[PDB]
Amino acid sequence: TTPESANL
Amino acid sequence: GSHSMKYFYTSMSRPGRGQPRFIAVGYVDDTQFVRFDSDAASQRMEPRAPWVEQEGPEYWDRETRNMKTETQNAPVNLRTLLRYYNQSEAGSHTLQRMVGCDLGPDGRLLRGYEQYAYDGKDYIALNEDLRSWTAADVAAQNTQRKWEAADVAESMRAYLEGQCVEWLPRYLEKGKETLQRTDPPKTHVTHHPVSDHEATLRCWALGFYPAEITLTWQRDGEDQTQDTELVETRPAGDGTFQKWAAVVVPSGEEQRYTCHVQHEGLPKPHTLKWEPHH
């Protein structure tokens, strides 16, 4: 399952 | 044995070709199981392996919302990276991410990953401890101190040690009949003259899974890794893989050489030599 994305 | 689940995201800005493009692909070892393209018609995560389709709609909507979210952030991170590196708009850039986890034969987490790369080069990466980071260059630091300030590593670490480790097995279970099986390489050697003085022996290895494999050319039992030409392992296109090692040899001295193939589907490595005579 795909994780959550954080923003650079 | 020990497996691994890996996702590979690719964000690409394309000035004057429309808003950034986001692509995602996922793998269980050497098998892709899902895919997403912000350009494709769908706009949903799609199954690329049979054993996945049996998940519920609940599962796919979740994934698709994610990929949609990734699609949304894409133009933001790309803009940020543009700021971080002091570049103008004109150019075309790429932001890559790779998150995944490796599990040992037991099933405990051997190590997770969470790393990015801007335009091919390293950008930032969760250290093996899953608690600290590593910034490739000065700009990348921006993201580092920003993620530290926000305990971003924490959430990533929770995923790597949780969701990732728990899921990888469900995929392996359903994928049982194919993911948890090893097809040994079908090997054979071929002879190809190159002159009146030298011939090329080529060691073949095809139709094998997983991708990891070792071909070695030995002369009198001596590793010939210097005069050996290895073609980069490739996809047969049906799930299995291929590969071949070639070494040039003095005519007659053919029998001087032996090929060694190592795969995890071969209890005892294959060892062959060329055959012509009679």
Binding site: - | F8, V25, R48, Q96, D119, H192, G237
Partner: protein, 99 residues
């Protein structure tokens, strides 16, 4: 910064004249990701050509698999034509039964 595509042309199965097979062209370890790949049959291109989903290696370099159904035969010749930003002009690689 920009790496040229690494090409390989081969069949899915051992070549057998008159017997159906697949023609693959594996381009790998290139950057950026934009790339064009055609499959040729006597220097005119083949239309029904599909390709894998854009993925990449641990060294970040990309790789795709292009392929089409085909029947290797006595006469007929096949090759892979590649186009990438690092190439002044198309790189053509003929398919060799022994490679």
């Amino acid at each position: 910064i920009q790496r040229t595509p690494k090409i390989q042309v081969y069949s899915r199965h051992p070549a057998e004249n008159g017997k159906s097979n697949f023609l693959n062209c594996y381009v790998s370890g290139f950057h950026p990701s934009d790339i064009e790949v055609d499959l040729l049959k006597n220097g005119e291109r083949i239309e029904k050509v599909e390709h894998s989903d854009l993925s990449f290696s641990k060294d970040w370099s990309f790789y795709l698999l292009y392929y089409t159904e085909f029947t290797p035969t006595e006469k007929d010749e096949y090759a892979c034509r590649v186009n990438h930003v690092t190439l002044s002009q198309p790189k053509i690689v003929k398919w060799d039964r022994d490679m």
